[PDB]
Symmetry: D3
Subunit: 224 residues, 6 copies
């Protein structure tokens, strides 16, 4: 076990969905999985294992911020042998190319964190997902009739930003939304030779100021 | 209200104890507070309001890491008018001068985060607590008989460090332990003109190599909890 | 009629193949492009327009290094109205998952350059290609039987590196090879709302030191050239 | 015997007051010490030993700027076995919470220097004083009826700043004044396991534009001096 | 022999004139050299050897940008035994001290590149030419009657800058013009213990927006070419 | 008139010799200057005005480190209208090209300071002297038979370095010795459009550990002193 997860070794399936909110994790388990079982609950951060169309899938909460997400993903990969990690979170849109409830696939995750400079020789790590997973998401979305928005996200250490004047420039450079974990998810899976992908649903639009079941079904179907 | 707290304005007393683990927040509520009332629970991050020896105090969980801690502390100060914030967390020791279950008062919080450079002109912000709260901690601990170790902590973005070779250097510069929130709590309270202090109890020793169970991280630290409650009385 | 291109507006088709070496650009025009016409030649950096399976395609040399690549790509987009930019080049392998003659599709381009920090608020810009273009490359490679390797590249300001001790760490973080332009092409295309993708053929293995002979170098690369022309038509 | 101090080993008491200005060091020796003795004079940077109310105490100049301070402090600790170093300097106020001639105790020293990143892994070192000395100063100030302001200072490489637009942000983050050595004093004493503290009296008010004269910066701060001598007794 | 130069070892003279544009290299070979042989042409990047008024000298193109220039200079020094490198080229004026057609000798080259921090301990490398070459340029221009402006240049990674708002500041600090290679040339010559100098001629004024005609760009730089060739004699 | 200089306006000649040690400044006034007159003494930092071979010449102490040197140089130029600043001093050699008693002319000054990044858009400022002054020194040294060594120096914030393992790399990049002010003097003179040059005499070798005796130090420094005074005539 670990300081942060109290599941037995082997309780996690090799494919795992991730959200920051452990209550969204619990919602998915109850609504979409058969024979769901809570397997961890340290710090109220819940994880579950269960079945979707007969196939095992795990769920795990990772909290908020790159440092929190990195703890849980590192342990899922190294201790619990998880191979495929699909984050399904929320984000604040900053681009006119997306609207409320749109699903974004993050093909790159920029950041204001120092974590990847520490990891990567003080240079610029382009934090990216596994390509096969990104291709799988695109094809799965197509057969579900979901319109996938695709681009970069900006993973910030700040929910309440001190650089809101720079949102336009981020959007100019194909950043569709801001969240707070993807660059850490991506860098950790790169570090540990695992397959990761971030999808986020737009819950706020930061420019225009304006029930993610479709993203959940997308994630479950691409793990089938 | 706020995106991460569903208490209404006025639910928090202006003095608030803080832990990363909302279950520790839950444990302190049930055991030490009379008429404890759960006042927030978004994302399972629990907060409480209750009285301690007749004086009202609040409790709030802040999650793990500077980014998580900053969200909750910002919201407590700006929206819930919390005035004094006392973090009582855990940490990993990197100094021979401390052992398991020792209490550390962080008079400075160094960091490998970029957050304070972003806040502070790309310069070095020396993240520090409110001196009056630190003096209270020292005096209260003296009165209670608690041996308070005082020094810097290092607030890291990494629980699993890529720089374990640097631990002796950190300890040479008076860093007693590593945790992951103090520099953010301190900078946020500095930004927002509030009073903050970080106390942390040693749950791991990174040199003599020990570690405490997740249960033990809630249960073996009543000394630090009582010290915090007494400071706020 | 930019400082570095003397074509007229309208001489470039909206899809353009890019190489650092203008002589390779010339090779492609003479071997593959019907009705190939030279349209620019400032600094001996040649560009061409022609047709491949009935579709208009342009070709342009960009020289070596992010700064050189950035000049040409900026001018192609902002003056000559190029919308899709497909770069093919060579690279030096640093990963045990790729070998000589492999074709790599760069789904991200890390860098030791300061250019993207200058462009992007002194933060970390994750320099990435257009997804629909990468989709086309994968689908076309499968169709042509090419076993496309997919991962990051590291775009360096140094051909002769001062950090060869870091190659294993780059390879651990899914960098398959080093070249010197992709981070620049990707960031310029992101800035200017254009669709770009980089493919590179492994001519040299920086770890084992194996290297293609000149005849091998042109034996392969022809496949990469066909891939690029096929995905653009 | 160092390049910068020509005292003999054993001339310094373990407790030493420090000023940047050696003529203030001279002023203190002549006015407040019995049996005072000039023990060093290299580069006109004077130091003295003598008694204050029967008790031995040393005084030493450290010049202006972190690099100068670090030289003298390093030598006082490593060569002359000084254990307690109390700086009593001057500063320029940037916060409305203080005025001319107020005394400030620096519970942290932010900086625009690169020295602490060089010392400390290119991370953020929170340069802080020894807590027991800081406790000593608060208690003695109270005991003497001296009003003592407490907060951070910002130690800059610049007397003539290029970032005066940033002073309000500094003041917002609890920086009461700007001086040029405390960060280096603090980090050197952390490096070398010594006890250090910085007090500074406001000699310039950067928001209203007052500036005392050179004569005045030596003679107008007797309360800070008496405070320092008292906490060393 | 080298990946980017296909001359035989010994084909270059120890003194080599450098220019970014290989067609300008060819122009110099035609108008100023006798018995000139083109000795290298990889990537259309021409180099020559021949006689300037009876004295053997070489010419070599280096492309655009620090990374491109560093490749060619490194190969000239380490493989082809070049000892004195004189670089000429154009620049964009940012100071009121220079105007169109002025020749600038760069006694320092500042930069927005990360390359010298990678080279030099992440500190500030002051990239400078060989002094004897600068003195020889100064005496040769005086003798030839050529007015030589002397100061710093700024070597940018960006031909199309994102920091045009900063040009006045660069000019205040004695940056007369912007180009894209000198900082790399100087750092490379310093690494490899070779002598190097950069002259540049103002073809464009980035402030007043004046520019030379197409004819003038062909014909106005002969005085700089002659100065270079003469100081190699 | 300034917080650090109590000279009357007009007390300084427009040509000023600088040295960090005010007692060395006094020594120069006392031995070489006709009608030498003390004009400032704030903080025991002496300065003088007088005549050498009939021409008026000022001397000024600037203390140790970039921050201190910047204070005095800024005030000399801005308040006292000093136009030409000739800095002498000592240095610690790190290159095998120089030995004890050698006089070094610094045509560039690298640094580990953050000052020039703060000054210069967070980019790399190449700190360089005025070229005319460098020629004057070379020509005067020639006339006087002095074998003047020319290259870069490294201006460090640290007398007691934490990076001694890097000295060989510094010397590789043509850094002949280490001192602590030149990068600041140069940047300040660039900022304020003044003419400055740094000369330093090798008193110690940090590689071979040779050192000049306390006596033989003063006879080696008269040569550099006379070089400086002869340049200002
Ligand atoms: N402006 C923003 N708007 C909506 N959601 C987010 C988020 C995401 O939601 C969480 C913050 O509520 C956090 O984990 C992050 O992934 N970050 N920033 C946001
Ligand atoms: N060796 C250790 N290293 C880093 N952080 C912690 C902590 C603290 O406990 C949590 C991480 O387990 C988080 O709240 C952090 O601040 N305890 N032990 C730690
Ligand atoms: N070790 C290496 N091996 C093969 N090719 C390259 C390249 C590519 O080839 C060019 C340098 O020869 C340049 O344009 C870059 O894209 N960089 N580094 C390389
Ligand atoms: N407005 C001001 N700004 C910066 N430093 C100082 C100082 C201090 O006084 C000296 C500079 O005058 C030096 O010791 C510095 O720490 N006094 N007033 C200052
Ligand atoms: N604004 C500018 N104006 C004129 N020349 C240049 C240059 C020089 O000309 C080349 C770009 O055209 C480049 O390699 C450099 O040598 N850079 N920036 C310039
Ligand atoms: N290793 C070293 N050796 C000799 N001199 C110096 C110096 C020079 O001498 C002073 C240090 O005593 C300082 O101000 C600088 O000018 N810095 N570092 C030195």
């Amino acid at each position: 076990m670990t300081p942060h997860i109290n599941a037995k070794i082997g309780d996690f399936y090799p494919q795992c969905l991730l959200c920051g909110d452990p209550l969204r994790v619990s919602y998915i388990a109850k609504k979409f999985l058969q024979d769901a079982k809570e397997i961890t609950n340290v710090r109220n951060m819940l994880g579950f294992s269960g079945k979707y169309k007969g196939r095992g899938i795990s769920l795990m909460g990772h909290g908020m911020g790159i440092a929190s997400c990195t703890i849980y993903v590192t342990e899922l990969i190294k201790t619990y042998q998880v191979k495929e990690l699909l984050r399904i979170g929320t984000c604040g849109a900053i681009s006119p190319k997306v609207g409320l409830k749109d699903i974004i696939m993050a093909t790159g995750a920029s950041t204001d964190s120092k974590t990847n400079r520490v990891r990567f020789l003080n240079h610029d790590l382009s934090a990216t997902p596994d390509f096969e997973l990104s291709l799988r998401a695109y094809q799965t979305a197509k057969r579900l009739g979901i319109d996938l928005k695709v681009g970069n996200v900006f993973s910030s250490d700040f929910f309440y930003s001190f650089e809101t004047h720079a949102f336009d420039l981020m959007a100019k450079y194909n950043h569709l939304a801001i969240e707070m974990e993807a660059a850490g998810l991506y860098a950790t899976a790169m570090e540990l030779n695992a397959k990761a992908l971030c999808l986020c649903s737009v819950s706020d639009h930061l420019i225009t100021k304006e029930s993610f079941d479709n993203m959940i079904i997308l994630a479950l179907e691409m793990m089938s």
